[PDB]
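Appendix B. One record, verbatim.
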Amino acid sequence: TMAFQELSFQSFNGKDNVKAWIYTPIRKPRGIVQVVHGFGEHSRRYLHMILKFNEAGFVVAADDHVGHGKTAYDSGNWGDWGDKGYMTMAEDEHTLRKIVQEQYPDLPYFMFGHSMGSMIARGYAATHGAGLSGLILCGTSGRFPNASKLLPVLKNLIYEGKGQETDLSYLEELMGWMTERIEQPKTPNDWISSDPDIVADHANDPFNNFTTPPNIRSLYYFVQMMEIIVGTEWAEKVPVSIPIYNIAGDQDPVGQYGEGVYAVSNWLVQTGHHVKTKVYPGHRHEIHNDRDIRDEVEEGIISFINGIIV
């Protein structure tokens, strides 16, 4: 058996080589947690959480998705998720899962996803959820504003040959509203946290994407991933054998300031799932990075997982 590992595998899109890591506990492993990062960030922002999971006895698997992190940094491809459709990221998560479960075949397996990573996790739980012991969603979305609107527009642009073109105005339409509750925001990303130092670190980290907006087909995929997970029509597809932990800050626009986070919990409860929810008052998107609650947020996830393994 192997401990800390660097690995890589070919993407579902057939062109990108996905960079990934496995972190193992020193104690006898009790479970696996697969960590799925969000839009424009990367998996090594999560080292603090990963080490907490390691010290709880959990193996941790994480990759940098196509267009992100070391995957984008090594290839130079920051703006194209490829030509195989919106499930590309969920399929790459499935590949990493099979790799880590080949090394640890008999452990309870949990998936954690933050932001777009919770959208990937939610779609994954509806397509590959067989075998999951638990699902943790952080900073997830309800019905995301303007997403329905851009879907046909982007789809038409694709069939017109514009798929690999880049246009910043579509992302700004999708995302530009998100500082709306913030008095005088210094940056368009101030909604990630009310701590300016976290926003500045996010901006200064070269493995986050501040160079290239995603091209038109990649934006299409993003909006598809937002829309395919909406309502009980999505929730019914998630096996009720998977309990769900749903956490967010109530100043977070992604989840409509607590309302859409509880809407998602309701969709799942309505369809027969066991759901535990926790909304942290007065916090924006990245509750797991806010330093005044970070330890509490991580302990809550571990306590949820321990409750299932027990």
